[PDB]
């Protein structure tokens, strides 16, 4: 699992 | 140099309008801690501006540098800005799902079962996927066929193409471990290949090789090296293979740089004979940036540079190893460019060297290798591969090269 974040 | 671009945005009611991945401890590409844009939100500020694209690397936002930060640090920086947002981005010069891995495995099975074997499809897929993606393909293939993909491809392929494809199916540590094992086959060793791997691999790479070697062959790599080498050559190979070189410290030790330079000169050109253990200790234990500065300071004391001093002071396998090691310290992409040129320049091809370098460096520093190659030899690495190899074997190598220069 790798993190992806909306900004 | 990749193009660095400035993008200015107004923070809207729903933010900047893009998504990021990457970061320290959250690498989007193996070995790369950078922050990457992975989605553009339709209707958002980034989309309406039009400049930011998927795959862009974020270098900074306002007063915050975004190089070598954790993912959470980048998120905090990007969510707590002024309304006026000034992004520094670097343009390039994968969104790989399980659907992609399963589709690849299914298409490879079809290519294997086709009458006469559809080698073109096998090459087009595997040489255009990363090592981790190939691992996903191999696991998906085993789940579908209840058979190992490597074994299936060994039966369907032959010649140099089989060697390329089977090498690509190994993890980096597995591939290096098997190449090292092959190099020590029989009395002594293929010293050239042993030197190439042991002198060019980093601490982290050697640590993984040492572990995987023991798991694959039920013996330590160091013991196999000891059994098949001797003399100062063995001592140098054993010392390097431990992978315990001093890590790149942020503080430069200039007094030690000067003392190492004096010690190298005192141990060789200055005296009758050579104090080889002193050379081994310094060149295996000091960090790579430290030794780059040592080799420059060495010129202040010695009438010859480090490479020329090695040629005059020692001979045989030991000379070869020291020469390869210093090249790897000074300019490793140039080192591999030279070995590639040598593998193709004359009659025939040293396919063992050509294949191993293309497989092992395709995901490490192939762009820098291609750049050093074109600059020194005037023609592209692509061109030399084209002239020395043919058919689907050539096509596989050209894909690992990645393009013409
Ligand atoms: Ca065929
Ligand atoms: Ca075969
Ligand atoms: Ca001497
Ligand atoms: Ca040739």
Look up the CATH number of the domain holding residue B271: 1.10.220.10
d(CA B309, CA B395): 41
Cβ–Cβ contacts within 10 Å for residue B172, how many? 18
CA nearest to A3 within chain B: B21
> Residues near B313 by Cβ (< 8 Å), separated by ≥ 6?
B268, B269, B274
Listed residue (B56, B91, B82, B70) closest to B24, CA to CA: B70
State whether B327 and B369 are in the same domain.
Answer: no
**Does B340 fall in a domain?**
yes
CATH number at B37 reads 2.30.42.10
**Does B248 fall in a domain?**
no
Q: Contact A7/B27, CB-based, under 8 Å?
A: no
Helices H, strands E: what count in chain A?
Answer: 0, 1
**What is the b/e burial string over B391-400, where b = at least 16 CB atoms within 10 angstroms of the residue's CB?**
ebbbbbbbbb
d(CA B357, CA B176): 11
**Does B375 fall in a domain?**
yes
Name the domain count of chain B.
5
Elucidation technique: X-ray
State whether B85 and B15 are in the same domain.
Answer: yes
State whether B328 and B357 are in the same domain.
Answer: no
**Does B2 fall in a domain?**
no
Q: Contact B20/A2, CB-based, under 8 Å?
A: no
d(CA B401, CA B361): 9
Which residues, in sequence order, are bridge partners of residue B58? B35, B89
Listed residue (B261, B255, B331, B252) closest to B287, CA to CA: B252
Listed residue (B55, B36, B56, B43) closest to B16, CA to CA: B43
State whether B160 and B186 are in the same domain.
Answer: no
Residue A1 C-alpha, separation from nearest chain B C-alpha, in angstroms = 9
State whether B12 and B86 are in the same domain.
Answer: yes
Per-chain residues with Cβ under 5 A from ion ligand 4: B 344, 388
Tell me if chain A has a CB within 8 Å of the CB of B339: no
Q: Contact B16/A2, CB-based, under 8 Å?
A: no
Cβ–Cβ contacts within 10 Å for residue B300, how many? 10
Place of tokens 């030991």: B318
Domain boundary among B242, B276, B298: B242
Q: Contact B75/A7, CB-based, under 8 Å?
A: yes
- 3-class secondary-structure state, position B61: strand
State whether B134 and B179 are in the same domain.
Answer: no
Sequence-ordered strand ranges (E) for B57-173: 57-61, 64-65, 84-90
- Closest Cβ opposite residue B18 in set A2, A3, A7: A7
d(CA B299, CA B292): 12
Tell me if chain A has a CB within 8 Å of the CB of B18: yes
**Does B249 fall in a domain?**
no
């Amino acid at each position: 699992h790798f993190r992806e974040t909306e900004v | 140099s990749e193009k660095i671009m400035e993008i200015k945005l107004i923070k809207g009611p729903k933010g900047l309008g893009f998504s990021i991945a990457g970061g320290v401890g959250n690498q989007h590409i193996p070995g790369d801690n950078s922050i990457y844009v992975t989605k553009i939100i339709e209707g958002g500020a980034a989309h309406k501006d039009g400049k930011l694209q998927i795959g862009d690397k974020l270098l900074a936002v306002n007063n915050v540098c975004l190089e070598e930060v954790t993912h959470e640090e980048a998120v905090t920086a990007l969510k707590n800005t002024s309304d006026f947002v000034y992004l520094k981005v670097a343009k390039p010069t994968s969104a790989y799902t399980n659907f992609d891995a399963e589709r690849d495995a299914l298409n490879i099975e079809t290519a294997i079962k086709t009458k006469g074997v559809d080698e073109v499809t096998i090459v087009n897929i595997l040489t255009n996927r990363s090592n981790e993606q190939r691992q996903d393909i191999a696991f998906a293939y085993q789940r579908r066929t209840k058979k190992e993909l490597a074994s299936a491809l060994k039966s369907a392929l032959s010649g140099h193409l089989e060697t390329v494809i089977l090498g690509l199916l190994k993890t980096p540590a597995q591939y290096d471990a098997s190449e090292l094992k092959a190099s020590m086959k029989g009395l002594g060793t293929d010293e050239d290949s042993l030197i190439e791997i042991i002198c060019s691999r980093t601490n982290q790479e050697l640590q993984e090789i040492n572990r995987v070697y023991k798991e694959m062959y039920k013996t330590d790599l160091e013991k196999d090296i000891i059994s098949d080498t001797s003399g100062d050559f063995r001592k140098l190979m054993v010392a390097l293979a431990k992978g315990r070189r001093a890590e790149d410290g942020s503080v430069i030790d200039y007094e030690l740089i000067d003392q190492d330079a004096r010690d190298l000169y005192d141990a060789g050109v200055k005296r009758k004979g050579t104090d080889v253990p002193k050379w081994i200790s310094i060149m295996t234990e000091r960090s790579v940036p430290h030794l780059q500065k040592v080799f420059d300071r060495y010129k202040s004391y010695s009438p010859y540079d480090m490479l020329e001093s090695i040629r005059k002071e020692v001979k045989g396998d030991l000379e070869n190893a020291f020469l390869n090691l210093v090249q790897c310290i000074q300019n490793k992409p140039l080192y591999f460019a030279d070995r590639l040129y040598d593998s193709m320049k004359g009659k025939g091809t040293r396919d063992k060297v050509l294949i191993r370098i293309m497989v092992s460096r395709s995901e490490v520093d192939m762009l820098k290798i291609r750049s050093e190659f074109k600059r020194k030899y005037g023609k592209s690495l692509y061109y030399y591969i084209q002239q020395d190899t043919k058919g689907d074997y050539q096509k596989a190598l050209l894909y690992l090269c990645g393009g013409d220069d």
